[PDB]
Design a protein around this ligand. Structure first.
Ligand code: DO3
Ligand code: DO3
Ligand code: CL
Ligand code: CL
Ligand code: CL
Ligand code: CL
Ligand code: GD
Length: 129
């Protein structure tokens, strides 16, 4: 599924991302745009063999099982394919664990370079929330 901006904001708010560990909702919408272009089916291979999956490009090195990243962990206890579904529940729950692990939202490269320090409220402006 390719989400609209306001559609995704509403879905993310419903699963409790708005102000999760102090990160306002516009930060999450901004990250998703630049990580995946709002597309749940996005995948991208990294140079060490791992792959990033879904709307927030979660990495098979630590977080999910894709059967081909040898000696990795699966700390969200899921197959990486559950992270490509049109329902974002599994992506959101896994991201809650990541953003809590000590590095906050800096774990998402595109957030650090394109969203951090900007007007992030602009990404939910106009939405009926
Ligand atoms: C809870 C998360 O920390 C899980 N974590 C994966 C788990 N392992 C081992 C472990 O963390 O016990 C990888 C080890 N490694 C450095 C280290 O921890 O020493 C990774 C660092 N990051 C996060 C961080 O630690 O900042 C990756 C996420
Ligand atoms: C093995 C190294 O990771 C040693 N580690 C010291 C041991 N403990 C906990 C533990 O690691 O079992 C520290 C807790 N902690 C992070 C965490 O683990 O959750 C501090 C951050 N860093 C590393 C990191 O986690 O990125 C400190 C280095
Ligand atoms: Cl915001
Ligand atoms: Cl694997
Ligand atoms: Cl959803
Ligand atoms: Cl933080
Ligand atoms: Gd770690």
């Amino acid at each position: 599924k390719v989400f609209g901006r306001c559609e995704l904001a509403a879905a993310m708010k419903r699963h409790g991302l708005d102000n999760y560990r102090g990160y306002s909702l516009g930060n999450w919408v901004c990250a998703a745009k630049f990580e995946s272009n709002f597309n749940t089916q996005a995948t991208n291979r990294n140079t060490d063999g791992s792959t990033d999956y879904g709307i927030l490009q979660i990495n098979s090195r630590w977080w999910c099982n894709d059967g081909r990243t040898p000696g990795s962990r699966n700390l969200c206890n899921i197959p990486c394919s559950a992270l490509l579904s049109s329902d974002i529940t599994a992506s959101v729950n896994c991201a809650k664990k990541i953003v809590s692990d000590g590095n906050g939202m800096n774990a998402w490269v595109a957030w650090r370079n394109r969203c951090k320090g900007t007007d992030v409220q602009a990404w939910i402006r106009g939405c009926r929330l």
